[PDB]
């Protein structure tokens, strides 16, 4: 089960200045980037074109190329339309793609946020507001849904193009998506709290616990999964302990990469 995410972020400082930047993810691996400065979308993996033919990708990049320019003006105009209800600075985020399930099954989404709050989605054959959205959004929704051409296209992107594109991506990218990188571990203390540092593992699922032999130490607090630059993960676990008690304390790590032989460290 993989989720394909096209995340768009657009800022508008005033009536004239704006920028739009995008990133694309398949699971937790970046596949494309399209910065405001670039006329074209960049592949970040060799297999980022997926199983698309060159003509097909050109046709697709072009669509987006036009959308970026269209989107910018539309927002600026929608601001003109609502004013002085809203005003700059303005922040719009889109999240679009599909979640792929076994065999044939998939489910597409397109979610819009305004000033960091989720307010709009494409659903079915039209745009609609979600619970909590402010009523003024009804005029933009009414305006956006008037555009039959945009509707048909967005419908085509979500129902057809996305799942098809992603099935191809998963084939082309099998090597990377299924890669196994081993974690490396080290130990440290702070004025006493012990820290088991676990770094460099892929994929994300990992097990990390402090142990006195077979006894599993509660009070072990794992933090968040932090990313490295090389597309592996970093995680650490802290255990709270009394001063003069580190004797016999181990850190045990399990991961799919290690294949059975756990990492055991001692202080």
């Amino acid at each position, epitope marked *: 089960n993989y989720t394909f995410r096209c995340l768009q972020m657009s800022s508008f400082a005033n009536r004239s200045w704006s920028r739009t930047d995008s990133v694309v993810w398949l699971g937790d691996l970046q596949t494309h980037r399209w910065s405001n400065d670039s006329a074209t979308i960049s592949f970040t993996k060799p297999w980022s074109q997926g199983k698309l033919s060159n003509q097909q990708w050109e046709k697709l990049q072009h669509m987006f190329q*036009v959308y970026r*320019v*269209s989107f910018t*003006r*539309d927002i600026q*105009e*929608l601001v*003109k*339309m609502m*004013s002085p209800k809203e005003d700059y600075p303005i922040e719009i985020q889109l999240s679009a793609g599909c979640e792929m399930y076994p065999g044939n099954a998939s489910e597409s989404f397109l979610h819009v946020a305004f000033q960091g709050k989720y307010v709009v989605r494409f659903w079915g054959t039209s745009w609609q507001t979600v619970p909590g959205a402010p009523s003024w959004l009804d005029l933009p929704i*009414k*305006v*956006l849904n*008037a*555009d*039959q*051409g*945009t509707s048909a296209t967005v419908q085509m992107l979500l129902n057809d193009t996305c799942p098809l594109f992603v099935r191809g991506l998963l084939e082309a990218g099998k090597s990377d998506l299924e890669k196994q990188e081993k974690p490396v571990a080290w130990l440290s203390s702070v004025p006493r709290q012990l820290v088991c540092h676990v770094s460099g593992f892929y994929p994300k699922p990992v097990w990390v616990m402090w142990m006195r032999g077979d006894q599993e130490q509660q009070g072990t607090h794992r933090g968040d999964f932090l990313p490295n630059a090389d597309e592996t993960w970093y995680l650490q676990a802290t255990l709270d302990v009394e001063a003069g008690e580190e004797a016999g304390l181990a850190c045990r790590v399990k991961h799919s990469s290690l294949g059975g032989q756990d990492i055991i460290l001692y202080w």
Partner: T-cell receptor
Amino acid sequence: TQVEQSPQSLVVRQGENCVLQCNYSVTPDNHLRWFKQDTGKGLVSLTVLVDQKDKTSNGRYSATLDKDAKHSTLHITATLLDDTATYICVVGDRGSALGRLHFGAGTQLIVIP
Amino acid sequence: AAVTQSPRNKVAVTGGKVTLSCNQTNNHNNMYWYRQDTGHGLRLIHYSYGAGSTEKGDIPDGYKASRPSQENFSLILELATPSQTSVYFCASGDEGYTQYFGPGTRLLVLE
């Protein structure tokens, strides 16, 4: 200028067919509409084409639109004196009121009765 | 669904104040002022998305716009110049892409 019309002007005899070109660089190109304008008067809409490769008619007027080529022609069949007018091309850049219309400078037709 | 302009025709002097009016009873939110000169297509001067709103178009200089109500949209020439001799068109519309045009207003500005 993003919308061009040809010929600039033309003289035909009553009963004769004519063809009017419109070429544009507008982006994106949601729709294209042909207006008829009598001298000294207003803009009567003849047809509006909307599809990638679209074809429309309206009595003696017919029209095509090819969006790949960004080209449209307006055929008048069996011209009458009243067809004497300026014919104007318009491309709209959205399918909503968020759009801007881009106007050709028109094609002037005279029909000799 | 129609639109009305007044006056239909106006002779004015340089330095004068000229007001061109547009009225629509379609309850359309959006209105638009264009000018037509031979050799150009209609060019957008000013527009409006509703009462109390006015927006610059492509060639706004020398013109003020005024939207006091859903019904009325005005084009104001504070200091008319010969170069504002033209035929002026008003239009209105709802959320759709169609713009419904008025009958046009001819203005001549003499020295």
